Amino acid sequence: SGLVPRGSHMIPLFKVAVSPTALDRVAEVFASGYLGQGPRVAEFESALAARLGNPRVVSVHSGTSGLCLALRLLDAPEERDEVLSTPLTFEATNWAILADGRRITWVDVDPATLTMDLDDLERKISPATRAIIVVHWTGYPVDLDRLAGILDRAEREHGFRPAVIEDCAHAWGASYRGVPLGSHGNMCVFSFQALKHLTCGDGGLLTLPGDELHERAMLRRFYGIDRTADRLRGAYDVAEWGLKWHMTDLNAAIGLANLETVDEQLRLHRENAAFYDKELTGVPGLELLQRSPDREGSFYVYDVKVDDRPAFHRKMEAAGIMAGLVSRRNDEHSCVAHLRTSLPGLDSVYDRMVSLPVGWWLTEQDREHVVATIRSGW
Amino acid sequence: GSHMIPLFKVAVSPTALDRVAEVFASGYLGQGPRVAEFESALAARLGNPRVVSVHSGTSGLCLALRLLDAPEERDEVLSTPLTFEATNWAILADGRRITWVDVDPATLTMDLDDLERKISPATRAIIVVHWTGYPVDLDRLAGILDRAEREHGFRPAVIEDCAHAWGASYRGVPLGSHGNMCVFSFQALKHLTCGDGGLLTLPGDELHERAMLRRFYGIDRTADRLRGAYDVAEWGLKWHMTDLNAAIGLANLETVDEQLRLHRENAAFYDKELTGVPGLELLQRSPDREGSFYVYDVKVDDRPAFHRKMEAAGIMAGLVSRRNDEHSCVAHLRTSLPGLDSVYDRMVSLPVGWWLTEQDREHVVATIRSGW
């Protein structure tokens, strides 16, 4: 009630992980006298590259910036103007496409996993298809090998093989068939926004599958300016323009601190999801998601599909549990009213979808309370 | 051997870390109540209530360009190439076409005559840069547009790039209140720094409401997002500022005026003590305005000798940026710019900021007057 609640206690769906040593690492940056892109950013990138097994990482200001950069690095004719993406993502994923001046073609959703319908994808690839953005939504890796096959066939068909940009905002630490995300031949964009697993306050990371892309990215993330050039004497050339997409030492310092604690919290994420997977089977009116075991997700949130959801919502509210949508389906926004397509898959789950708290911040008592409340019916 | 005087430097209040620590203690690192505090503080100084904080000056520009309502066929943005690259790359990222406008060799700002000639039926907007802190003749620019509007319907928009001009005024009025969108920068090297940050000021309420939405994906943050009860009428990106940086800006607001005073005080010294130097031409600055002197601009003869002289004297001197039209990524946009051509091999920027001891500024003048 404006400045209150209902007697006591609430369970949040998202929360910010801030290592106690973060302020320490920040004070060291202030002591350095340099707040821009410095040695800490370099330190961060080496740390991340080590974990990911991909040396071609490029830290950026935010995940959205990483997506924007990734789309600029695409070399393809202006007549390939179509980007295939699903409307069940965060708006950043699709607004990045509009900012790049391209056209969105909506791809449907797999009601089993609430990720992109790879069947529907293959049908919609056309000669105009510039690229495809796949989102490992809420932490679950999309079938990458299958996607490779889909592209293999599309290439064999009409000349070009479309680029794939993986949106890994929710999927830090995730792997696919034993291989960490970032190492499957696609550009990948991680997010280090406050609510994400590894947070820099705000931040992001673009990993590249090749050296030529890597180099272009190192440059274009800062206006196209070689930062080691004698700029004072005007001795540099911008071969490809860019914007302010890089990450500064201030945020890199935070991310370095949270790397100390991210693994444990990721473990708890998966451990709580496991608990839910176990204790929520065979609940009437609740349909769990089917997850393939050849991959390991990150469970940004726990997605379920429910009957009589408005009641379920009321139930969670009374029980003091935050539950709902990460985002509205992006295609319903009036600013893309013209791109509407029939998406039967999503049309069938969107009134049933709901995300549940599953993060590291849940006490045992908390996850037991969610299960208790859910099983006690609605 | 020893000692160097830098052209740019980062001003960071001792209370900055305090303000950041208070923010961690808040548990919220996103766009919150500190950002709102900062914006109120800034609106107070600028006398413009319609302020919108953004992630960086460049983001402010990009946002400003998106707010423009104009038909897609007006694909022309007028800008001068003697700016920081950000001013113009923002134009390209918006997918428009740049038409270069020349430079007035007296002030090293946009040649408003050349501008008047170049306003075309394709003209979408005009970006004027108060380069290095010196306000453009805004009243004259208003006339140019006034006439262009009377003539055939459309009045192109003006975006003032105030990255170098925090605190600057024009005919008694602080930048930000002259009827144009303005974009300030709080980047590390700027007068008021947030570590990184910027501020977009709007001249009207409708632009303001829109900028508030579009700086964060077009998503109303007070909306019931959890229940999907919000609508994005115009898309946007992550252009907004978080509490983390807003806090730093709040700390530095405490010290920015004094440092700005010293910028101008050091520039005054130079204006006095560098007249009548053979081979050195000062810039002629108008008295109906008050600049901010990001750097001190002069034009010199036999510049390569000059450079070597400063380097020998342990003085950092040179260019903020290469003229933008010379970059290979805009080779297709090259145009004849005689005005700029006549100064670009004579240009040099000199340290004028708050970090200069009395001893330092004397050392610069001494070194310059002793010839090269």
mmCIF file with all atom_site columns, N, CA, C and O in Angstrom, chain B residues 36-77:
data_model
loop_
_atom_site.group_PDB
_atom_site.id
_atom_site.type_symbol
_atom_site.label_atom_id
_atom_site.label_alt_id
_atom_site.label_comp_id
_atom_site.label_asym_id
_atom_site.label_entity_id
_atom_site.label_seq_id
_atom_site.pdbx_PDB_ins_code
_atom_site.Cartn_x
_atom_site.Cartn_y
_atom_site.Cartn_z
_atom_site.occupancy
_atom_site.B_iso_or_equiv
_atom_site.pdbx_formal_charge
_atom_site.auth_seq_id
_atom_site.auth_comp_id
_atom_site.auth_asym_id
_atom_site.auth_atom_id
_atom_site.pdbx_PDB_model_num
ATOM 1   N N  . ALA B 1 36 ? 17.437 10.319 -10.274 1.00 0.00 ? 36 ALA B N  1
ATOM 2   C CA . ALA B 1 36 ? 16.447 11.368 -10.194 1.00 0.00 ? 36 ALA B CA 1
ATOM 3   C C  . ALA B 1 36 ? 16.988 12.571 -9.451  1.00 0.00 ? 36 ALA B C  1
ATOM 4   O O  . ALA B 1 36 ? 16.623 13.692 -9.753  1.00 0.00 ? 36 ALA B O  1
ATOM 5   N N  . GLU B 1 37 ? 17.788 12.336 -8.420  1.00 0.00 ? 37 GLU B N  1
ATOM 6   C CA . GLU B 1 37 ? 18.391 13.420 -7.650  1.00 0.00 ? 37 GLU B CA 1
ATOM 7   C C  . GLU B 1 37 ? 19.309 14.255 -8.511  1.00 0.00 ? 37 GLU B C  1
ATOM 8   O O  . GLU B 1 37 ? 19.249 15.468 -8.477  1.00 0.00 ? 37 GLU B O  1
ATOM 9   N N  . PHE B 1 38 ? 20.140 13.574 -9.297  1.00 0.00 ? 38 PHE B N  1
ATOM 10  C CA . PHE B 1 38 ? 21.091 14.187 -10.219 1.00 0.00 ? 38 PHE B CA 1
ATOM 11  C C  . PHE B 1 38 ? 20.347 15.042 -11.222 1.00 0.00 ? 38 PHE B C  1
ATOM 12  O O  . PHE B 1 38 ? 20.655 16.180 -11.410 1.00 0.00 ? 38 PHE B O  1
ATOM 13  N N  . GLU B 1 39 ? 19.330 14.496 -11.848 1.00 0.00 ? 39 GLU B N  1
ATOM 14  C CA . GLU B 1 39 ? 18.572 15.253 -12.800 1.00 0.00 ? 39 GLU B CA 1
ATOM 15  C C  . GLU B 1 39 ? 17.932 16.487 -12.229 1.00 0.00 ? 39 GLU B C  1
ATOM 16  O O  . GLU B 1 39 ? 17.817 17.473 -12.917 1.00 0.00 ? 39 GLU B O  1
ATOM 17  N N  . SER B 1 40 ? 17.493 16.446 -10.982 1.00 0.00 ? 40 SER B N  1
ATOM 18  C CA . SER B 1 40 ? 16.889 17.625 -10.364 1.00 0.00 ? 40 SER B CA 1
ATOM 19  C C  . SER B 1 40 ? 17.915 18.683 -10.104 1.00 0.00 ? 40 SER B C  1
ATOM 20  O O  . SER B 1 40 ? 17.655 19.858 -10.261 1.00 0.00 ? 40 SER B O  1
ATOM 21  N N  . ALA B 1 41 ? 19.082 18.234 -9.683  1.00 0.00 ? 41 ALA B N  1
ATOM 22  C CA . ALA B 1 41 ? 20.191 19.101 -9.415  1.00 0.00 ? 41 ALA B CA 1
ATOM 23  C C  . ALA B 1 41 ? 20.613 19.781 -10.691 1.00 0.00 ? 41 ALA B C  1
ATOM 24  O O  . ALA B 1 41 ? 20.804 20.985 -10.706 1.00 0.00 ? 41 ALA B O  1
ATOM 25  N N  . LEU B 1 42 ? 20.738 19.008 -11.766 1.00 0.00 ? 42 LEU B N  1
ATOM 26  C CA . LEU B 1 42 ? 21.126 19.546 -13.060 1.00 0.00 ? 42 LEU B CA 1
ATOM 27  C C  . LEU B 1 42 ? 20.061 20.481 -13.589 1.00 0.00 ? 42 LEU B C  1
ATOM 28  O O  . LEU B 1 42 ? 20.373 21.527 -14.096 1.00 0.00 ? 42 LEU B O  1
ATOM 29  N N  . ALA B 1 43 ? 18.799 20.127 -13.459 1.00 0.00 ? 43 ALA B N  1
ATOM 30  C CA . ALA B 1 43 ? 17.755 21.012 -13.939 1.00 0.00 ? 43 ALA B CA 1
ATOM 31  C C  . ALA B 1 43 ? 17.785 22.350 -13.222 1.00 0.00 ? 43 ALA B C  1
ATOM 32  O O  . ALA B 1 43 ? 17.392 23.362 -13.761 1.00 0.00 ? 43 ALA B O  1
ATOM 33  N N  . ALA B 1 44 ? 18.203 22.331 -11.966 1.00 0.00 ? 44 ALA B N  1
ATOM 34  C CA . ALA B 1 44 ? 18.308 23.527 -11.145 1.00 0.00 ? 44 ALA B CA 1
ATOM 35  C C  . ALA B 1 44 ? 19.332 24.484 -11.696 1.00 0.00 ? 44 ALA B C  1
ATOM 36  O O  . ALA B 1 44 ? 19.088 25.683 -11.784 1.00 0.00 ? 44 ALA B O  1
ATOM 37  N N  . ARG B 1 45 ? 20.499 23.947 -12.023 1.00 0.00 ? 45 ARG B N  1
ATOM 38  C CA . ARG B 1 45 ? 21.568 24.741 -12.563 1.00 0.00 ? 45 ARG B CA 1
ATOM 39  C C  . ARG B 1 45 ? 21.231 25.272 -13.931 1.00 0.00 ? 45 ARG B C  1
ATOM 40  O O  . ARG B 1 45 ? 21.463 26.428 -14.233 1.00 0.00 ? 45 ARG B O  1
ATOM 41  N N  . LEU B 1 46 ? 20.674 24.423 -14.770 1.00 0.00 ? 46 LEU B N  1
ATOM 42  C CA . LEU B 1 46 ? 20.468 24.798 -16.145 1.00 0.00 ? 46 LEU B CA 1
ATOM 43  C C  . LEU B 1 46 ? 19.220 25.645 -16.279 1.00 0.00 ? 46 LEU B C  1
ATOM 44  O O  . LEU B 1 46 ? 19.044 26.327 -17.255 1.00 0.00 ? 46 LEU B O  1
ATOM 45  N N  . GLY B 1 47 ? 18.337 25.604 -15.306 1.00 0.00 ? 47 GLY B N  1
ATOM 46  C CA . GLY B 1 47 ? 17.135 26.391 -15.407 1.00 0.00 ? 47 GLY B CA 1
ATOM 47  C C  . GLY B 1 47 ? 16.174 25.840 -16.407 1.00 0.00 ? 47 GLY B C  1
ATOM 48  O O  . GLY B 1 47 ? 15.255 26.512 -16.816 1.00 0.00 ? 47 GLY B O  1
ATOM 49  N N  . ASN B 1 48 ? 16.372 24.578 -16.747 1.00 0.00 ? 48 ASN B N  1
ATOM 50  C CA . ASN B 1 48 ? 15.539 23.841 -17.687 1.00 0.00 ? 48 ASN B CA 1
ATOM 51  C C  . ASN B 1 48 ? 15.030 22.589 -16.996 1.00 0.00 ? 48 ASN B C  1
ATOM 52  O O  . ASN B 1 48 ? 15.812 21.703 -16.680 1.00 0.00 ? 48 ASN B O  1
ATOM 53  N N  . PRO B 1 49 ? 13.719 22.489 -16.786 1.00 0.00 ? 49 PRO B N  1
ATOM 54  C CA . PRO B 1 49 ? 13.195 21.356 -16.042 1.00 0.00 ? 49 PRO B CA 1
ATOM 55  C C  . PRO B 1 49 ? 13.138 20.111 -16.867 1.00 0.00 ? 49 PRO B C  1
ATOM 56  O O  . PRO B 1 49 ? 12.969 19.035 -16.316 1.00 0.00 ? 49 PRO B O  1
ATOM 57  N N  . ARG B 1 50 ? 13.237 20.254 -18.176 1.00 0.00 ? 50 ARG B N  1
ATOM 58  C CA . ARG B 1 50 ? 13.103 19.123 -19.040 1.00 0.00 ? 50 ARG B CA 1
ATOM 59  C C  . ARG B 1 50 ? 14.432 18.459 -19.313 1.00 0.00 ? 50 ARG B C  1
ATOM 60  O O  . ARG B 1 50 ? 14.892 18.468 -20.418 1.00 0.00 ? 50 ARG B O  1
ATOM 61  N N  . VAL B 1 51 ? 15.052 17.867 -18.305 1.00 0.00 ? 51 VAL B N  1
ATOM 62  C CA . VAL B 1 51 ? 16.311 17.171 -18.519 1.00 0.00 ? 51 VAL B CA 1
ATOM 63  C C  . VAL B 1 51 ? 16.141 15.652 -18.475 1.00 0.00 ? 51 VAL B C  1
ATOM 64  O O  . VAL B 1 51 ? 15.269 15.129 -17.800 1.00 0.00 ? 51 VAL B O  1
ATOM 65  N N  . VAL B 1 52 ? 16.958 14.958 -19.254 1.00 0.00 ? 52 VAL B N  1
ATOM 66  C CA . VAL B 1 52 ? 16.928 13.519 -19.363 1.00 0.00 ? 52 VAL B CA 1
ATOM 67  C C  . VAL B 1 52 ? 18.325 12.950 -19.343 1.00 0.00 ? 52 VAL B C  1
ATOM 68  O O  . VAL B 1 52 ? 19.016 13.072 -20.301 1.00 0.00 ? 52 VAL B O  1
ATOM 69  N N  . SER B 1 53 ? 18.754 12.332 -18.257 1.00 0.00 ? 53 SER B N  1
ATOM 70  C CA . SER B 1 53 ? 20.087 11.745 -18.178 1.00 0.00 ? 53 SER B CA 1
ATOM 71  C C  . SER B 1 53 ? 20.231 10.524 -19.072 1.00 0.00 ? 53 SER B C  1
ATOM 72  O O  . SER B 1 53 ? 19.277 9.819  -19.302 1.00 0.00 ? 53 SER B O  1
ATOM 73  N N  . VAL B 1 54 ? 21.408 10.323 -19.640 1.00 0.00 ? 54 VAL B N  1
ATOM 74  C CA . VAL B 1 54 ? 21.642 9.208  -20.524 1.00 0.00 ? 54 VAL B CA 1
ATOM 75  C C  . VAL B 1 54 ? 22.986 8.617  -20.220 1.00 0.00 ? 54 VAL B C  1
ATOM 76  O O  . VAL B 1 54 ? 23.763 9.186  -19.510 1.00 0.00 ? 54 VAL B O  1
ATOM 77  N N  . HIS B 1 55 ? 23.257 7.465  -20.786 1.00 0.00 ? 55 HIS B N  1
ATOM 78  C CA . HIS B 1 55 ? 24.429 6.700  -20.447 1.00 0.00 ? 55 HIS B CA 1
ATOM 79  C C  . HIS B 1 55 ? 25.723 7.398  -20.800 1.00 0.00 ? 55 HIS B C  1
ATOM 80  O O  . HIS B 1 55 ? 26.707 7.245  -20.097 1.00 0.00 ? 55 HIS B O  1
ATOM 81  N N  . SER B 1 56 ? 25.717 8.166  -21.885 1.00 0.00 ? 56 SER B N  1
ATOM 82  C CA . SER B 1 56 ? 26.917 8.820  -22.408 1.00 0.00 ? 56 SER B CA 1
ATOM 83  C C  . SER B 1 56 ? 26.492 9.923  -23.334 1.00 0.00 ? 56 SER B C  1
ATOM 84  O O  . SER B 1 56 ? 25.341 9.963  -23.746 1.00 0.00 ? 56 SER B O  1
ATOM 85  N N  . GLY B 1 57 ? 27.398 10.849 -23.628 1.00 0.00 ? 57 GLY B N  1
ATOM 86  C CA . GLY B 1 57 ? 27.058 11.932 -24.520 1.00 0.00 ? 57 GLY B CA 1
ATOM 87  C C  . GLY B 1 57 ? 26.620 11.424 -25.867 1.00 0.00 ? 57 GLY B C  1
ATOM 88  O O  . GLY B 1 57 ? 25.610 11.868 -26.367 1.00 0.00 ? 57 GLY B O  1
ATOM 89  N N  . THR B 1 58 ? 27.303 10.413 -26.390 1.00 0.00 ? 58 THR B N  1
ATOM 90  C CA . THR B 1 58 ? 26.964 9.831  -27.683 1.00 0.00 ? 58 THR B CA 1
ATOM 91  C C  . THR B 1 58 ? 25.574 9.258  -27.699 1.00 0.00 ? 58 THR B C  1
ATOM 92  O O  . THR B 1 58 ? 24.872 9.409  -28.677 1.00 0.00 ? 58 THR B O  1
ATOM 93  N N  . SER B 1 59 ? 25.195 8.580  -26.618 1.00 0.00 ? 59 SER B N  1
ATOM 94  C CA . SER B 1 59 ? 23.861 8.024  -26.442 1.00 0.00 ? 59 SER B CA 1
ATOM 95  C C  . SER B 1 59 ? 22.839 9.127  -26.418 1.00 0.00 ? 59 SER B C  1
ATOM 96  O O  . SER B 1 59 ? 21.745 8.985  -26.899 1.00 0.00 ? 59 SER B O  1
ATOM 97  N N  . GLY B 1 60 ? 23.168 10.214 -25.765 1.00 0.00 ? 60 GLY B N  1
ATOM 98  C CA . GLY B 1 60 ? 22.313 11.374 -25.815 1.00 0.00 ? 60 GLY B CA 1
ATOM 99  C C  . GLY B 1 60 ? 22.064 11.878 -27.217 1.00 0.00 ? 60 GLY B C  1
ATOM 100 O O  . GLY B 1 60 ? 20.967 12.307 -27.536 1.00 0.00 ? 60 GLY B O  1
ATOM 101 N N  . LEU B 1 61 ? 23.083 11.820 -28.065 1.00 0.00 ? 61 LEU B N  1
ATOM 102 C CA . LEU B 1 61 ? 22.935 12.272 -29.435 1.00 0.00 ? 61 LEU B CA 1
ATOM 103 C C  . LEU B 1 61 ? 22.054 11.344 -30.210 1.00 0.00 ? 61 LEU B C  1
ATOM 104 O O  . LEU B 1 61 ? 21.162 11.778 -30.926 1.00 0.00 ? 61 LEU B O  1
ATOM 105 N N  . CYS B 1 62 ? 22.321 10.054 -30.059 1.00 0.00 ? 62 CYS B N  1
ATOM 106 C CA . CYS B 1 62 ? 21.573 9.014  -30.725 1.00 0.00 ? 62 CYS B CA 1
ATOM 107 C C  . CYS B 1 62 ? 20.119 9.073  -30.336 1.00 0.00 ? 62 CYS B C  1
ATOM 108 O O  . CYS B 1 62 ? 19.245 8.925  -31.157 1.00 0.00 ? 62 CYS B O  1
ATOM 109 N N  . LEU B 1 63 ? 19.864 9.309  -29.069 1.00 0.00 ? 63 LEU B N  1
ATOM 110 C CA . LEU B 1 63 ? 18.512 9.482  -28.598 1.00 0.00 ? 63 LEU B CA 1
ATOM 111 C C  . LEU B 1 63 ? 17.886 10.707 -29.217 1.00 0.00 ? 63 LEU B C  1
ATOM 112 O O  . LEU B 1 63 ? 16.756 10.671 -29.649 1.00 0.00 ? 63 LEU B O  1
ATOM 113 N N  . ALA B 1 64 ? 18.610 11.815 -29.211 1.00 0.00 ? 64 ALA B N  1
ATOM 114 C CA . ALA B 1 64 ? 18.124 13.053 -29.809 1.00 0.00 ? 64 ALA B CA 1
ATOM 115 C C  . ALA B 1 64 ? 17.747 12.892 -31.272 1.00 0.00 ? 64 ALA B C  1
ATOM 116 O O  . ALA B 1 64 ? 16.722 13.377 -31.703 1.00 0.00 ? 64 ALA B O  1
ATOM 117 N N  . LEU B 1 65 ? 18.534 12.129 -32.010 1.00 0.00 ? 65 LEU B N  1
ATOM 118 C CA . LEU B 1 65 ? 18.257 11.919 -33.410 1.00 0.00 ? 65 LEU B CA 1
ATOM 119 C C  . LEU B 1 65 ? 17.052 11.020 -33.629 1.00 0.00 ? 65 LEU B C  1
ATOM 120 O O  . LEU B 1 65 ? 16.334 11.173 -34.601 1.00 0.00 ? 65 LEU B O  1
ATOM 121 N N  . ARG B 1 66 ? 16.799 10.105 -32.708 1.00 0.00 ? 66 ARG B N  1
ATOM 122 C CA . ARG B 1 66 ? 15.651 9.230  -32.836 1.00 0.00 ? 66 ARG B CA 1
ATOM 123 C C  . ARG B 1 66 ? 14.364 9.963  -32.553 1.00 0.00 ? 66 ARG B C  1
ATOM 124 O O  . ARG B 1 66 ? 13.331 9.627  -33.099 1.00 0.00 ? 66 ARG B O  1
ATOM 125 N N  . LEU B 1 67 ? 14.418 10.954 -31.680 1.00 0.00 ? 67 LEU B N  1
ATOM 126 C CA . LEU B 1 67 ? 13.235 11.720 -31.322 1.00 0.00 ? 67 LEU B CA 1
ATOM 127 C C  . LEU B 1 67 ? 12.705 12.572 -32.434 1.00 0.00 ? 67 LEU B C  1
ATOM 128 O O  . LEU B 1 67 ? 11.598 13.080 -32.346 1.00 0.00 ? 67 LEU B O  1
ATOM 129 N N  . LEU B 1 68 ? 13.514 12.747 -33.467 1.00 0.00 ? 68 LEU B N  1
ATOM 130 C CA . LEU B 1 68 ? 13.133 13.544 -34.628 1.00 0.00 ? 68 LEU B CA 1
ATOM 131 C C  . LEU B 1 68 ? 12.017 12.920 -35.446 1.00 0.00 ? 68 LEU B C  1
ATOM 132 O O  . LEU B 1 68 ? 12.123 11.790 -35.930 1.00 0.00 ? 68 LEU B O  1
ATOM 133 N N  . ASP B 1 69 ? 10.941 13.683 -35.571 1.00 0.00 ? 69 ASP B N  1
ATOM 134 C CA . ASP B 1 69 ? 9.808  13.302 -36.386 1.00 0.00 ? 69 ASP B CA 1
ATOM 135 C C  . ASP B 1 69 ? 9.917  14.041 -37.696 1.00 0.00 ? 69 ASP B C  1
ATOM 136 O O  . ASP B 1 69 ? 9.698  15.248 -37.767 1.00 0.00 ? 69 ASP B O  1
ATOM 137 N N  . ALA B 1 70 ? 10.267 13.302 -38.732 1.00 0.00 ? 70 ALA B N  1
ATOM 138 C CA . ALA B 1 70 ? 10.433 13.877 -40.041 1.00 0.00 ? 70 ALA B CA 1
ATOM 139 C C  . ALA B 1 70 ? 10.407 12.746 -41.036 1.00 0.00 ? 70 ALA B C  1
ATOM 140 O O  . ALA B 1 70 ? 10.779 11.620 -40.705 1.00 0.00 ? 70 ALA B O  1
ATOM 141 N N  . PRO B 1 71 ? 9.937  13.034 -42.256 1.00 0.00 ? 71 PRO B N  1
ATOM 142 C CA . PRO B 1 71 ? 9.812  11.993 -43.270 1.00 0.00 ? 71 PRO B CA 1
ATOM 143 C C  . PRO B 1 71 ? 11.172 11.408 -43.617 1.00 0.00 ? 71 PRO B C  1
ATOM 144 O O  . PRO B 1 71 ? 12.172 12.113 -43.560 1.00 0.00 ? 71 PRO B O  1
ATOM 145 N N  . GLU B 1 72 ? 11.198 10.129 -43.961 1.00 0.00 ? 72 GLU B N  1
ATOM 146 C CA . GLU B 1 72 ? 12.444 9.429  -44.221 1.00 0.00 ? 72 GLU B CA 1
ATOM 147 C C  . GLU B 1 72 ? 13.259 10.023 -45.361 1.00 0.00 ? 72 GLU B C  1
ATOM 148 O O  . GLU B 1 72 ? 14.467 9.816  -45.409 1.00 0.00 ? 72 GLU B O  1
ATOM 149 N N  . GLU B 1 73 ? 12.618 10.770 -46.265 1.00 0.00 ? 73 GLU B N  1
ATOM 150 C CA . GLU B 1 73 ? 13.329 11.317 -47.429 1.00 0.00 ? 73 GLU B CA 1
ATOM 151 C C  . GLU B 1 73 ? 14.183 12.524 -47.111 1.00 0.00 ? 73 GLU B C  1
ATOM 152 O O  . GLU B 1 73 ? 15.102 12.844 -47.845 1.00 0.00 ? 73 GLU B O  1
ATOM 153 N N  . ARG B 1 74 ? 13.889 13.197 -46.016 1.00 0.00 ? 74 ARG B N  1
ATOM 154 C CA . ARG B 1 74 ? 14.795 14.198 -45.517 1.00 0.00 ? 74 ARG B CA 1
ATOM 155 C C  . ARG B 1 74 ? 15.862 13.392 -44.838 1.00 0.00 ? 74 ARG B C  1
ATOM 156 O O  . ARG B 1 74 ? 15.745 13.090 -43.666 1.00 0.00 ? 74 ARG B O  1
ATOM 157 N N  . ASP B 1 75 ? 16.878 12.986 -45.577 1.00 0.00 ? 75 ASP B N  1
ATOM 158 C CA . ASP B 1 75 ? 17.823 12.034 -45.038 1.00 0.00 ? 75 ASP B CA 1
ATOM 159 C C  . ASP B 1 75 ? 19.125 12.724 -44.751 1.00 0.00 ? 75 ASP B C  1
ATOM 160 O O  . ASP B 1 75 ? 20.137 12.092 -44.462 1.00 0.00 ? 75 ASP B O  1
ATOM 161 N N  . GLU B 1 76 ? 19.084 14.044 -44.829 1.00 0.00 ? 76 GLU B N  1
ATOM 162 C CA . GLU B 1 76 ? 20.283 14.849 -44.686 1.00 0.00 ? 76 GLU B CA 1
ATOM 163 C C  . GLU B 1 76 ? 20.455 15.493 -43.315 1.00 0.00 ? 76 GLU B C  1
ATOM 164 O O  . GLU B 1 76 ? 19.577 16.188 -42.829 1.00 0.00 ? 76 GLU B O  1
ATOM 165 N N  . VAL B 1 77 ? 21.604 15.246 -42.705 1.00 0.00 ? 77 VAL B N  1
ATOM 166 C CA . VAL B 1 77 ? 21.996 15.921 -41.483 1.00 0.00 ? 77 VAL B CA 1
ATOM 167 C C  . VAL B 1 77 ? 23.227 16.769 -41.771 1.00 0.00 ? 77 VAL B C  1
ATOM 168 O O  . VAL B 1 77 ? 24.188 16.290 -42.350 1.00 0.00 ? 77 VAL B O  1
#
